[PDB]
Amino acid sequence: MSKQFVRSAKNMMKGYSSTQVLVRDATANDSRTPSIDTLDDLAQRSYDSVDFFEIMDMLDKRLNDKGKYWRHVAKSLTVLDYLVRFGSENCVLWCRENFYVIKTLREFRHENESGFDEGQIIRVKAKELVSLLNDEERLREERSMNT
Amino acid sequence: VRSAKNMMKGYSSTQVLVRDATANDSRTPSIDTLDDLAQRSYDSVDFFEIMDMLDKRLNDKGKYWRHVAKSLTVLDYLVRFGSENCVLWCRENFYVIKTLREFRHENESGFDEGQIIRVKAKELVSLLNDEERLREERSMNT
């Protein structure tokens, strides 16, 4: 019967493409960090305009979430930080137009049922990206060494 | 004559059955409904339609707690009496089952209605945690 990759097609029936699958699996729901090859692949695929839209529209709905789904925002800021300084130049221009989205994540606070503020990592992760996008002299170089 | 309750544009027999099994009401899922879901979970295309709906129903919050609760009882029946791939689907999505162990909610009356979602989510994790008894339970299902 079905094995390992057939059960992973549960998202394929849910209307997803290869680019939409791995960017969805990148911002997973466990304490695992996205594999760099997935972040590297997303950077290379961001050059294609068809993939770049599906990538950004996916992270758009992953960043506007709150509640117990704090791993939607924390991991999306991680891949978005990689796309900004490794992928297409439109990844920078896209964050400049949706700038007030990560600007509101500056105050993300979600406490789980144990007195632990899980949103603290989302605070420093969002404040760092804003400080990077507002430094064009720094941001331009960071995209140069990664070539 | 009473096909009128098929006001379901887009969904199929399997998708409507699982939605009617986890609907937001006081009606409890019956065994003849659960055994049909377990029977259809053996079929390939029917299996994904059951998991795709339980996925959208388990990931609910707010006052729609009855969608999450019934999806746990339905999933428990699919782990034991359903297909083997149902257990594989629960292993790859074992975190969605654990995130509901911290679920909390109470209606505007004062009673914590999330108390039942926790216990149902807890015993399901401990069920999959005991892989020895799992094959034992799936063996009796002859």
Residue numbers in the entry:
A (entry chain A): 1 to 147
B (entry chain B): 6 to 147
Original authors' sentences:
Clathrin-mediated endocytosis is essential for protein retrieval during neurotransmission and receptor recycling. Accumulation of the adapter proteins at the plasma membrane initiates the endocytic event and contributes to membrane bending. Complex formation has been observed between the ENTH domain of epsin and the ANTH domain of Sla2, the yeast homolog of human huntingtin interacting protein 1 related (Hip1R). Epsin and the phospholipid PIP2 are essential for clathrin-mediated endocytosis, and we show how assemblies are formed between the ENTH domain of epsin and the ANTH domain of Sla2 in fungi.
A crystal structure was determined of a complex between the ENTH domain of Ent2 (ENTH2) from S. cerevisiae and the PIP2 phospholipid to a resolution of 3.4 Å. The structure shows two ENTH2 domains sandwiched around one PIP2 molecule. The inositol head group of PIP2 is bound to the previously identified phosphatidylinositol-binding pocket of one of the ENTH2 molecules. In the second ENTH2 molecule, the N-terminal α0 is unfolded (ENTH2Noα0), and the electron density suggests the N-terminal residues are extended. In the ENTH2/PIP2 structure, the α0 helix points away from the ENTH2 domain and there are no interactions with the phosphoinositol group. As a result of α0 reorientation pointing away from the ENTH2α0 molecule, the second ENTH2Noα0 molecule can form interactions with the phosphatidylinositol head group. However, most of the buried area (1020 Å2) contributed to the dimer interface comes from the α0 helix of the ENTHα0 domain, which is repositioned by the PIP2 molecule to facilitate dimer formation. The effect of PIP2 binding is therefore twofold; it attaches the ENTH domain to the membrane and displaces the α0 helix, so it can form a dimer with a second ENTH domain. In the ENTH2/PIP2 structure, two α0 helices from symmetry-related ENTH2α0 molecules stack against each other to create a homotetramer containing two PIP2 molecules in the same plane, ready to insert into the membrane. We thus conclude that the PIP2/ENTH2 crystal structure shows an intermediate state, where the binding of one PIP2 dimerizes two ENTH2 domains and prepares the “empty” ENTH domain to bind another PIP2.
